[PDB]
């Protein structure tokens, strides 16, 4: 007389976090002869690494696994919980536009974006893209900015804003102002 | 044993555009969902319909026990809420500074989002009654030359259906 065993639950990562665009990959580490992943959406995936999902808040959820042995023998449900964060709205972008040189260039937003990074004609290089406080004109605390007229970043052409939120590290973009 | 009638959300009413989620929260070897507009699916979380009129309707699920003895029928009822209208905006656009701003349609939207250079965030887009001239009642609005909207460019607005909750864009006007 033979009975076959049952396969102890799998192993699954813990809960994660994925910003909306970003990527929500959930594999197991366990051994299978078969694996059966399901969850929000219509996910469904027979793999030990399912294909990976580009987040949206309707992929926010619980997702569950439970793996088969050779004679078909399974194991218990196991799961792991997603949460997707949303982006951030686009911020709309008024400015000083028509501005003499000499004259201090204002860049600002309504949307309260936490913080704010402005890209501009010298682009957004980490190095120009420096630390956040100060009086870093690149980097701001607040949808606003000004920039003097001795500043290096004090250029014509086009500017849009990136919004970040800091509690969430999610960042959404905003219109090209000339 | 035949499998108890799974569990299924109460009545929805998803708005013309928004997704309809429905979901199970029961344990199956197999669920069976089937409804309008060829809607089929054999999960518990089936996928996601991004609805339009033809979805509305009563969709139904059915679990299943290892042997394939079936619990009965249940149903959950999707109500479809349609879009309001695509506005037509007409305005005085050849305007001399000083003189009041009008932009006007003829769409009956309940509330009127009105949205300009100044963008449109929930900052700008404030309480929905008093002297906001960015969010009235009605589908009009008068902005005076000593307001801080009082701005060129591209407006367009935005109809709010007040008991659906529905809302419709328009065209834009420069």
């Known amino acids: 007389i033979r009975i076959y065993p049952t396969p102890a639950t799998p192993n699954v990562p813990a809960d994660f976090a994925v910003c909306e665009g970003e990527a929500i990959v959930l594999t197991t580490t366990t051994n ?32 569950h696994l439970y ?18 964060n949303a982006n951030p709205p686009i911020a709309t972008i008024t400015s000083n536009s028509p501005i003499c040189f000499g004259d201090t260039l204002t860049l600002s937003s309504s949307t309260n974006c936490g913080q704010s990074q402005w890209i501009g004609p010298n682009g957004n290089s980490t190095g120009t893209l420096g630390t956040p406080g100060g009086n870093n004109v690149l980097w701001t605390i607040g949808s606003t900015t000004n920039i003097p007229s001795t500043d290096s970043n004090y250029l014509s052409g ?6 970040i939120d800091t509690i969430t590290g999610c960042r959404s973009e905003s219109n090209t102002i000339t």
């Open 67 to 84: 793996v088969t042995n050779t004679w078909g023998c399974q194991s218990l449900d196991t799961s792991v919980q997603v949460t997707v």
């Open 158 to 163: 086009d500017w849009y804003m990136i919004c």
């Open 32 to 63: 299978a002869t078969s694996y059966f992943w399901t969850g929000p959406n219509g996910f469904q995936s027979n793999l030990q690494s399912p294909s990976v999902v580009n987040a949206t808040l309707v992929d926010a959820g619980s997702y």
